[PDB]
Amino acid sequence: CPLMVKVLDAVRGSPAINVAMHVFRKAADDTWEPFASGKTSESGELHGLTTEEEFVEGIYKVEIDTKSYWKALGISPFHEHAEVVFTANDSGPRRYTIAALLSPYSYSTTAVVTN
Amino acid sequence: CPLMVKVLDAVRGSPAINVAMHVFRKAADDTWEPFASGKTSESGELHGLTTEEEFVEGIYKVEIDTKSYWKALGISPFHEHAEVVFTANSGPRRYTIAALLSPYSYSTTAVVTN
Amino acid sequence: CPLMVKVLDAVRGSPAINVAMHVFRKAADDTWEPFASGKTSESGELHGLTTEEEFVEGIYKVEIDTKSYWKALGISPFHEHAEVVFTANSGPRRYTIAALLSPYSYSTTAVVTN
Amino acid sequence: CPLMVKVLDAVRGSPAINVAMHVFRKAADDTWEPFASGKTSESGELHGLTTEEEFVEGIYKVEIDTKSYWKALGISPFHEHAEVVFTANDSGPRRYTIAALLSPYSYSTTAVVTN
Ligand SMILES: O=C(O)c1ccc2c(c1)OCCOCCOCCOCCOCCO2
Ligand SMILES: O=C(O)c1ccc2c(c1)OCCOCCOCCOCCOCCO2
Ligand SMILES: O=C(O)c1ccc2c(c1)OCCOCCOCCOCCOCCO2
Ligand SMILES: O=C(O)c1ccc2c(c1)OCCOCCOCCOCCOCCO2
Question: H or E stretch including C69?
Fold first, then answer.
């Protein structure tokens, strides 16, 4: 599991459950190509997006659909989504945990990178 | 204005207005001596807490009553308050303390400029 | 000033100065049309990106080049940039986008006022 | 494990390792009484601070010594520590995870509360 995403809800003090997200990888023509997608579990975590062999060097974008999450809770939020754009594995393979902390008008995204 | 505090509401996307806070300065016996207080304005800011000659070296604590802010909005928050504890004054400096409030989370940042 | 961006450096406790950013507006084909751009001032702020009559309904993206900011400080950051994507203008509103930068983390907040 | 603390370093993109913290509980005389203490592990986590039987209703304060952490990394930070002051278990027992995200001039503290 080289790429994992964890999402927290700062209004409820809970994991953010059933949050959809889409991962893209920049292709040779400099367009965003679909890579993987999934939804957070009851723990707010999404595992299994990719494998060590599949997650090669590249520039990746994770688009977390925070808007649909907030709307399902009855909240009309500011952002369309929470994004993470990063270069991966250019020093060799790493494990990436992306942590997103969500409020209706604010979010933070943090990476924990281990070798 | 050596010390300014700004408070934002991350639920509503607005300044957090009428947020009360007290500032204390740590005394030699390790007790917190009353120093300054006020509440945020319609812009979410609290200005005029102190003056340059009054604000000397020490450990200061800003205790922001975030619980009362959320209670007034009918949201049951996690924190009793937000406490920002820092050593101030290498000589005088200007300090802006920002607090970003959510019911179960808060962030605080300091800008120290000249 | 319908749209203002403020950027802070959480490592140094300072405004983030000379941070470049582009603003795009989503077009009908789902491509990002150039809209506005600039770089932050000595106060970390970027003002004057647009006018009320120009800033109409749409989905807007602010792409802040945080990577170049950290590279200039000799710190290898995580993010290529910070992207703030939001629907703007229920009629005109005033938008302040704040970004708080660390090498491996960023936070962004919006204040929408009248 | 009704109370767990997780600490992340936003400069290095790593768990914040060997961070000391002290937990206090407000006593009947309205003073802060020592409760528990410990240090974060290699994963940035501190477990085992208390037990379901020991962690009764009350007002608790966690003081995380972020200043000594940053100084050991050669950084002179703004805050003396990162604090969390909260009422616990007044609706019945809950499990509390306190997540702290650290930068030299900024920190955020978030609670995940489960039943
Ligand atoms: O348990 C919660 O507090 C919780 C809280 C929030 C949950 C959520 C659960 O989703 C659980 C799975 O729901 C599947 C059926 O719902 C389908 C429609 O989902 C629309 C997006 O919902 C996002 C929030 O989902
Ligand atoms: O402005 C928003 O988008 C917004 C967004 C979300 C707001 C919210 C506002 O709360 C505003 C004050 O609500 C009035 C009192 O409601 C009492 C019940 O509140 C239950 C918890 O609501 C959490 C979300 O509150
Ligand atoms: O202002 C601080 O307290 C502060 C605090 C921390 C600063 C830091 C400043 O970096 C300022 C610019 O550093 C000059 C170039 O150093 C190159 C090597 O940097 C290695 C990574 O340093 C991370 C911490 O950088
Ligand atoms: O592995 C790291 O990146 C790391 C990174 C940071 C580590 C840290 C490890 O501490 C590992 C345990 O060190 C025990 C011996 O050091 C005693 C003095 O510790 C002073 C406080 O250090 C806080 C940072 O500790």
Answer: helix C66-72
Distance of alpha carbon D95 from alpha carbon D108, whole angstroms: 20
D13·A101 Cβ contact <8 A: no
Identify whether the C-beta of residue D2 lies closer than 8 Å to the C-beta of residue D98: no
For CA atoms B49, B54, B60, B61, the dihedral sign is negative
**What's the rounded Cα separation, in Å, for the pair D74 and D68?**
10
The structure tokens listed for A46 are 């999404």
Task: Give the distance (Å) from ligand 1 centre to CA of residue A20.
Answer: 10
C67: number of Cβ within 10 Å: 19
> Do A5 and A62 meet the contact criterion of CB atoms below 8 Å apart?
yes
Domain count, chain B: 1
Q: Does the CB atom of residue D76 touch ligand 3 within 6 A? A: yes
Nearest CA in chain C to A58: C80
Burial of D17 (0-12, 13-18, 19+ CB in 10 A): middle
Q: Are A98 and A110 contacting, i.e. CB atoms less than 8 angstroms apart? A: yes
**Does D13 contact chain C (CB < 8 Å)?**
yes
Range of the domain at D100: 1-115
Residue by residue, DSSP assigns D58-108 as: EEEEEEE-HHHHHHHTT---SBS-EEEEEEESBTB--EEEEEEEEETTEEE
Touching chains, D (3+ CB pairs < 8 A)? A, B, C
Strand partners, C57: none
Contacts of B105 in chain C (CB under 8 A): none
CB–CB contact C109 A109 (8 Å): no
Structural determination approach: X-ray
